[PDB]
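Limitations
The structure tokens in this dataset are predictions for the assembled complex, not deposited experimental models. Users should treat interface geometry with appropriate caution, especially where small molecules or nucleic acid strands are included. An illustrative entry is reproduced here so readers can see what is and is not provided.
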Amino acid sequence: TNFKFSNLLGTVYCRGNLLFSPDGTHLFSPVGNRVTVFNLVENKSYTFPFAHRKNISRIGLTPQGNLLLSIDEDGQAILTNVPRRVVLYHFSFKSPVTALAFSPSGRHFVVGLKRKIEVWHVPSTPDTNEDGDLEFAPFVRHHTHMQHFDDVRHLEWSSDSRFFLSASKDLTARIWSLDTEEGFVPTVLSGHRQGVVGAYFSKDQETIYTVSKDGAVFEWKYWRIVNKHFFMQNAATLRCAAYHAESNLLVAGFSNGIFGLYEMPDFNLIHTLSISQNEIDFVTINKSGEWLAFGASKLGQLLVWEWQSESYILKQQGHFDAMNSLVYSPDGQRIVTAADDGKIKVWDVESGFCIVTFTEHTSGVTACEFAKKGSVLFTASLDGSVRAWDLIRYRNFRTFTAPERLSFTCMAVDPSGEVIAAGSIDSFDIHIWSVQTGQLLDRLSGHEGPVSSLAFAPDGSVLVSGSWDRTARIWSIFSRTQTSEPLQLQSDVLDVAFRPDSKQIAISTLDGQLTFWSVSEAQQVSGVDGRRDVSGGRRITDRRTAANVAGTKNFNTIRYSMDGTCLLAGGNSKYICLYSTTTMVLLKKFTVSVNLSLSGTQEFLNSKLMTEAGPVGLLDDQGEASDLEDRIDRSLPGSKRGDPGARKKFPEVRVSGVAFSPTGNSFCAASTEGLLVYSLDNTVQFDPFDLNMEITPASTLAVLEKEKDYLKALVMAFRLNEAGLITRVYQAIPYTDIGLVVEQFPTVYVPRLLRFVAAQTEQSPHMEFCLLWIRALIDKHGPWLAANRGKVDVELRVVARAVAKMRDEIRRLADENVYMVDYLLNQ
Amino acid sequence: TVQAATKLIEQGHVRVGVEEVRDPAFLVTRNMEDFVTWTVGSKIKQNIMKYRDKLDDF
Amino acid sequence: GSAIFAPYRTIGLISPTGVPFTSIPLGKTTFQITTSVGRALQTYDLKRGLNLVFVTRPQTPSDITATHAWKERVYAAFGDPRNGEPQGLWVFQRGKKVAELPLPSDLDQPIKQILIFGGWIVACALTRIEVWKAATLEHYTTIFPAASKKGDNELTGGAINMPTFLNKIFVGRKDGWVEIWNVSTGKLIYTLLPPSPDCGAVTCLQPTPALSLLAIAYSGGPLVIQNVLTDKTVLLLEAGTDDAPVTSISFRTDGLGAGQDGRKDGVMATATSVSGDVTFWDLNKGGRIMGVLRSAHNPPSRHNIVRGGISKIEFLAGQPVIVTSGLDNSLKTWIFDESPFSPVPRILHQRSGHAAPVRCLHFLPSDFDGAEGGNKWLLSGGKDRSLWGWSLRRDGQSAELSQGAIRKKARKMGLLAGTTTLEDLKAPEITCIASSLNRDGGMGAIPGKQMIWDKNAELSGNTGWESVVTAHKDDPYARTWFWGRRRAGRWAFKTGDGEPVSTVAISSCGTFALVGSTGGSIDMFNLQSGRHRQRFPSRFAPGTGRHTNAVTGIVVDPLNRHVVSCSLDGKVKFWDFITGNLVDEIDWAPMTKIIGCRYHPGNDLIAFACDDRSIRVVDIETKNTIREFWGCRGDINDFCFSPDGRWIVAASQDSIIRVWDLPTAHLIDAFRLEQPCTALAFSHTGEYLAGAMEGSLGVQIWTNRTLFRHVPTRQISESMMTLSLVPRSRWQTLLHIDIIKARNKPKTFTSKLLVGGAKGDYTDFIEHLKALPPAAADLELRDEATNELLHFIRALTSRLVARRDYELTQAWMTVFLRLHFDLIMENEELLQALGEWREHQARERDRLSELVGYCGGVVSFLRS
Amino acid sequence: SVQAVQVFGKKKNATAVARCVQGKGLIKVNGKPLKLFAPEILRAKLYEPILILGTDKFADVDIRIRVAGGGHTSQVYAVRQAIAKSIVAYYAKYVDEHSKNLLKQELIQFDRSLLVADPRRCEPKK
Amino acid sequence: SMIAPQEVYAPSKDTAEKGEVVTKAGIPIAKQEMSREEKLRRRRREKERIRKA
RNA sequence: UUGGGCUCUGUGGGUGCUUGGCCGCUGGCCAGACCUACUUCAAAGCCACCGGGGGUACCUACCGGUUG
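Predicted assembly:
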């Protein structure tokens, strides 16, 4: 109904510098638009509210780690408040930002522009000044100096924040002040071979280290050089280096995926190992000195490394190709997504990590689904195969395929998961296997084109095929008459989705129109023409205008919500489109991406770009690169779906698949720039239910403390719908009076209460309290819940989620303790 | 001619399968030489049904 | 001051004041133009458009009365000591203050001429000149002119510098005199007498591009242009009217421009405070006139509300381009082209704002989610009868929504060269504006050129239509607008009764406009086709539900089910959308006159401004008045929901802005400005308010402190078995730290249990094992009552009765029973503690297992 | 520069064209008016889109129908399909887009065979 | 990624080194216990498997 | 409404969040100024995109040498 933006998910890393918190337990990882922090000593991730226009170039942090300055390309700056996750200042450096170092005294920051070195005062924030607000132009500038010769790759401060030092792109480093010292002249650290990727201080600020690109690392004293020392490496050049000055150690990541780790008062190898086949982009290093963080920018490939207990505390990766499907477990706690990378991987909704990555397909995984159970992950791929994964044992039962070789593009499993349907583009019959046998049960007829959406009913009596014969089809398999019932449509069927009670079905068809059909007596009940609602216009290489492109004006994927009221709909476009079923009105619409290193974002793309060659973001500037594997264009001419070649500049904006969360209040878009979760935001927006003039928090707490009437206080606090008040009265009434209140409680606030005590069971430390609440609610409200059973089917299942993450998390421990002590007491 | 068809697939009237192809170097395989036609709201397609005197504004 | 909101910037505003601009040359490629906001300054580029570079902060205490942009610093002078406010001369650089300047103690006069030359900064107040040495910012002397009749001492021509004249300054008095002062030593060195002694007050003076010549400019009309070391006149002209003398005079230093083809120098420009017309003079033979820009800026109109006039002319030095700045909130700049020879230029740039106060405000809704959405576009309908779509993110991307080629009709009519005038040639002034963009298709909506306010549908239904429907002051026409095209839309609508429009709404599906007369009826006009679709009522009683007097508020349920109407004369009325009939009314007839209405969708809340100075809040489906807020002493000028649905902010007629909480139902804050605020609007993030104050020709923006810090105020002013609080990712890693260590591989403190066993309180030790990292907790958990095992089993038994960490009790106990089973299977000193621990474990375990067996098995039954 | 819409309709073999233009209420089927075509007992099935949609939707248009092929019944279904598609199509291209969707809702809530003709194939049972 | 119990141990002919025989029930039943009738029935059962296979 | 209409052309702003024009830049210049110094110590290696089959006299590369 009212969905705001929750975490971006499904990409751990994109281009950009990454950083630790000063506590060491938060990792600040840039994804394309945004920055995800994930809490690493207690795994819980969050993405910030903001969203840049381009890809994140950099991030800096205040030493009191409360203030985060991010940079998108062409210098487009932000600084936000990390403890209270709010976005605070906008700024714009005019050059692109290629180096950024925030001062250790929390007072200045040096930015290194494309040759310019500008040192800025950090703005005082409303968290700092006493009676203060946002100023207008808060960034004031302390100095700027452009006495360099080429780009400035790195900036490293001192420890006492009075000198800083610049690692070039020309050949040199330079040592610089903040104010004029009396015996200091600002001076230049001389010749390397290629050009320095770092130049780091010690603790004692006499010897200065400097790390080039051609492997060599020099130690300078006072101003000549005390010892230059290289190290060998066969076919790679040194592309990142971080130096912890307290523990005296230098990491160095390379072009061939390897990093070396060197204790350096004198040159002395601690360790080295290889983590990617591709280059190492960014190295950051913990304040303790114990965790190293490496980002490899080509694939996802974020990893954190304990350098003395030689072990991956983190090694995570996104998808390096377009996704094709996501679903949720029926618990609702993990989303699985498949891609054209070949892997199908299992992501946890909390903690922001992939818990599994299955690599046993090759060549791109099309579809992905569960049964009723949530044990088995049935997936389908262009390898030609439907693999049925065992998700408790993390390995597959049974890989089915077709007798003649196919490449399946669609997949639907029965809810009682003993029947598989799949469907391809090469053949245009529909193949059905049996799971509890292993063979192929049938292949089914009827369609004059490649069947392009398959869906079983959640009853499991009816299969539904939607094909490019501009038709749909009711397949009544399970009885003695395996009969069909066609649905003559107007255009090529793109999608098919079921109402969660199986009495009504929706199809997307290639016009851009959705239509709604009765299933029992097959008959169209309704329909949307959504062609104008979905138009995310004017990709580049469109010489047509934004509103004339047919090709962004259709829905690839549709779902219903778990109530059965709103539909998600989405296509090869920028807008996710949230309709309803009864009144058919477009309820809500979401712009997926604000990005501008994506392609299909700006409709009405501006004419400053179009040079007299064409679009300036269409000129192949790959020869403007200083590395050979960057320069080599090993692409194949004219490949749309997955190729290893992949020039891959300005990818477009699609949603590759939406799905609703099985618990309420959330939303998934499998888009190109990640895997977005939208959530029904409830902690800022006041929304009462049926409220009167007297009912204040002073009135709820008044009948909570003065004259204790617990039913009137409970229905009162529900009737405000404020979480602090329902928590207050909830933890205020006693566990003797629970059965009184629920024994006389109104029937029409019951599923709100079931969702609340389910959340309090799963989150608050009040086991026997909340389980007494659930016991009273189901004991009194038994015939109501069993009689309705579909009106409340989401409320009963967020409860069954809570009383089975309690039944399995601590009573395995209670059983193992009581029988273990029974043994040790038996001797 | 190949110049007319190239100009049409850089103005974006064609599709291969379900996706509006705008690449003139898109290699077409032997069974994808069946699922290639004009895109949805195509002025070329209204000229074809208009020539054949069987169009329908519906 | 205020509690929640705080001043951020006053936006909609380029040059209101009669304090002139200031030009400076940057390099060889840009000039920079510095105007006065009021209590701030602004600099603008030339080459980068007239885009904003800085706006000066902190906001100075009084209003600014003088300015001068020297080398890199912008100097400002502010304050009228004759009436109250403190004076001062602040010195800015990069938009921030870098110096002050010490005024004398003996000073009581507002200070009008800032003038830097030599090594001197010289300011001229009203009858004295205070001169600071500029190399040290240190006060040098104060020059006092002579006096004869208590008017001759007045200094109204200002003061000025010649290029090659050394330490001297030339002042123009209220007598005809211009005096020559050696400002380094204070002395009146020479004085020169006016020609034509009937014309005797120096209104404006300027140096020449020639050496040693001035254009001194008298109130009776003559421009006199003179040698000042021969004291001999070079030319005499009759430029001013006695009713309208020259107040601005500016030579061109391009080097060409004169001689009826344009090859000789000697091009003069003059203007007057009484007209908005600038007059050019060829200067060679006897100095003929050559042309006049008529209504360059608006004229100062008697009996009109716009604020035209001029303030300054400057030829941008060495260049064919001339900036002039009016008093109608407009700075423009004009260019002498050379391919024909026009003695009257065309505009190269113009930036302008409202030349009148702002009557209505509206923030435009969200570009659907993000992408510069929610907040950036203000939309102000002022009293100069024109919309403006202001921008927060950059001031240079703001422009009028055009009502047509109006300056083409104004110069094409006689209406620009002195029936009606130009503001009267626009639309009426705007009472309200209503927008809903989901059918705004960008720049290209209907991509041709359409008739304005007429009184296709395939190209409409594919590309867009009009966004902003608008109700005006005294007209029966709700006129519509394209937002993305910045243009008057192709529709205007009547009401049905013919009476003027009272309140105009647009449905949030963007398809229906919905207009409301001051006579009572409601019409509904489809914006795509521009066609009347539904009347309220159509044709309780089915046909009879009609209002009495003006419908002062109407808004649509955003699922298009009901539209709710809200008249002044009595009651609020509940209409069916798809039928037009009348469903239910809420009746406040003998008491109320609802003057205004706001709506929050997603909260279903409608806030009414009853003329009892109250705001009655009602929920549209509950249909019961959920609240009322009694806090206003003047009537409600404006009121607005905060985007959260928490707050109501009402600007009252008594010049107090108030804000009430909706959950608490109490006044959070209330504060008092200098002027009554006419218009209020929130963003759709919570980040901004805007208010239009009665008197200033811009709006000002207030940021919201409840986002950026914790303002805590709520002052009604006037004037069992529990778990721990430890993460599952802190104790489950203790359980499984055998395999988490293995998949992660590539291819006094020990006396706390002792002291805590000496006392009967283990809670310090439990307060350690709840707080150690899991490697150190499996590490640290890995005779005669100084053993640790009996202290541990006794500790977890104490915690099992104390009932404070059940999952951590079972966690620590199961890892303990896996890695200490030998010494407890053989040792005997502790099997009393495993007996008692087993007994209490059997109690709490059997109870909790009965609970969750009932809950899991019966909830997991009721799902089938 | 006229407001013209061409529209077809189908049954077994009866195909019907209908041209709908800016007119004054008439519907003429093969020259003769609509209340004269299709022998008496099926003219209610001719009128079904008119008295679903209301004549106020039709008082601004002119519908000209040519019908060929088939028998009497199939010509009736071809006519009424051409009527319904004619007005939905005219309101698609010339009056606003909301009114199209409302007319499609009225016709589809009655019978979808007024808009999409579903010709019968056969059933070779398994 | 662990292993099923029937893939850790499943009772069969290779698992029993006996004068008994592990049946299809998984239970070893010894021939010395087996009378005339049960050895007869297992002959006719395995010969039923030969006439099928 | 004391003229109107099509078409074409030009200029300015806009089509992404507002921190200055230039230099030999912690300073200076926007009217420029001064112009030619100062010197102890050549370099570390590796890698580095030509379509398929085939020829090898001459050149070149590499490998093993040969005397002088």
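Some entries come with short summary sentences. For this one: Chains C and B do not touch (no CB pair under 8 Å).
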